Amino acid sequence: ASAARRKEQELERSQEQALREKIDSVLLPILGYGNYTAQVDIQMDFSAVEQTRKRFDPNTPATRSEYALEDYNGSVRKESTRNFELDTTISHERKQTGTVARQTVSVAIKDRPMSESEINAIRQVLIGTVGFDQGRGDLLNVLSVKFA
Amino acid sequence: ASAARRKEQELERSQEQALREKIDSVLLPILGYGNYTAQVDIQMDFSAVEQTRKRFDPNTPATRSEYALEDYNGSVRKESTRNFELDTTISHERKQTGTVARQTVSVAIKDRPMSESEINAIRQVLIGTVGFDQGRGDLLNVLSVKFA
Amino acid sequence: ASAARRKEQELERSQEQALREKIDSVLLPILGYGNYTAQVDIQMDFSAVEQTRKRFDPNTPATRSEYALEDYNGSVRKESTRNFELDTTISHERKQTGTVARQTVSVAIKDRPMSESEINAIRQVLIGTVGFDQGRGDLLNVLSVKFA
Amino acid sequence: ASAARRKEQELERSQEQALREKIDSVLLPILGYGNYTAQVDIQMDFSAVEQTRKRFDPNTPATRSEYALEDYNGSVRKESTRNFELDTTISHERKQTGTVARQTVSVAIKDRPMSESEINAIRQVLIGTVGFDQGRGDLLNVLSVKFA
Amino acid sequence: ASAARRKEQELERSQEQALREKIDSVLLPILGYGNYTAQVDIQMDFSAVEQTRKRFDPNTPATRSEYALEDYNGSVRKESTRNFELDTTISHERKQTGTVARQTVSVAIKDRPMSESEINAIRQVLIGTVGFDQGRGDLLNVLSVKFA
Amino acid sequence: ASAARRKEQELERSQEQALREKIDSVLLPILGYGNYTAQVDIQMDFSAVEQTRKRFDPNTPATRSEYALEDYNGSVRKESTRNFELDTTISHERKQTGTVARQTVSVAIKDRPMSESEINAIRQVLIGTVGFDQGRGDLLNVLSVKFA
Amino acid sequence: VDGIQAEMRAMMVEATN
Distance between CA atoms of residues F119 and F66, nearest Å: 71
Would you call A118 and B77 a contact, using CB atoms and an 8 Å cutoff? no
Count of positions (residues) in chain E:
148
F touches D (3+ CB pairs < 8 Å)? no
A117-to-A29, A124, B118, B119, B145 alpha-carbon distances in Å: 18, 10, 20, 18, 10
F touches E (3+ CB pairs < 8 Å)? yes
Q: Report the candidate in E21, E8, E1 with the shortest Cα–Cα distance to residue E98.
A: E8
Distance between CA atoms of residues E64 and F65, nearest Å: 10
Distance between CA atoms of residues C30 and C27, nearest Å: 5
D74 neighbourhood in chain C, CB within 8 Å: none
Instruction: Give the DSSP per-residue string, C63-130.
Output: EEEEEEEEEE---EEEEEEEEEE--EEEEEEE--S-EEEEEEEEEEEE-----HHHHHHHHHHHHHHT
Residue D104 carries which side chain, given as an amino acid letter?
A: T
The DSSP secondary-structure symbol of B134 reads G
Question: What distance, in Å, lies between the first and last C-alpha atoms of chain B?
Answer: 45
Q: How far is F22 from chain E (nearest CA, A)?
A: 7
Q: Which residues have a Cβ under 8 Å from the Cβ of F52 and sit 6 or more positions away? A: F90, F91, F92, F93
Q: Which chains would you list as touching D if contact means 3+ CB atom pairs under 8 Å?
A: C, E, G
State the method: cryo-EM
Locate all alpha helices (DSSP H) within chain E, ordered by sequence: 2-31, 116-129
Distance between CA atoms of residues F147 and E130, nearest Å: 38
Q: How many whole angstroms from its chain centre is CA B56?
A: 27
CB atoms within 10 A of CB A89: 16
Q: How many whole angstroms from its chain centre is CA A84?
A: 39
Count of positions (residues) in chain G:
17
**Resolution, angstroms, 1 dp:** 3.6
Burial environment of residue F79 by CB neighbours within 10 A (0 to 12, 13 to 18, 19 or more): exposed
Would you call C22 and A6 a contact, using CB atoms and an 8 Å cutoff? no
**Which of D 37-56 lie inside 8 A of C, CB atoms?**
none
Q: Coil, strand or helix: which one is E73? A: coil
Q: Report the candidate in F136, F131, F145 with the shortest Cα–Cα distance to residue F40.
A: F131
- Pick from E22, E35, E94: which is nearest to D148 by CB? E35
Q: How far is A51 from chain G (nearest CA, A)?
A: 7
Instruction: Give the DSSP per-residue string, G1-17.
Output: -HHHHHHHHHHHHHHH-
Burial environment of residue A130 by CB neighbours within 10 A (0 to 12, 13 to 18, 19 or more): buried
Residue A66 exposure: Cα atoms within 13 Å on the Cβ side = 17
Burial environment of residue F72 by CB neighbours within 10 A (0 to 12, 13 to 18, 19 or more): middle
Distance between CA atoms of residues C132 and C120, nearest Å: 14
Beta bridge partners of D94: D50
- Angle between helix D116-129 and helix D2-31 axes, rounded to 10 deg: 140
Distance between CA atoms of residues F23 and F17, nearest Å: 10
Question: What distance, in Å, lies between the first and last C-alpha atoms of chain D?
Answer: 45
The DSSP H or E segment spanning B125 is: helix B116-129
Q: Is C89 on the interface with A (CB under 8 A)?
A: yes
Residue B21 carries which side chain, given as an amino acid letter?
A: E
Q: Which residues have a Cβ under 8 Å from the Cβ of B93 and sit 6 or more positions away? A: B50, B51, B52, B53
The DSSP H or E segment spanning C16 is: helix C2-31
Q: Are A105 and A126 in contact (CB under 8 A)?
A: yes
Q: Is B64 on the interface with A (CB under 8 A)?
A: no
Would you call E88 and G1 a contact, using CB atoms and an 8 Å cutoff? no
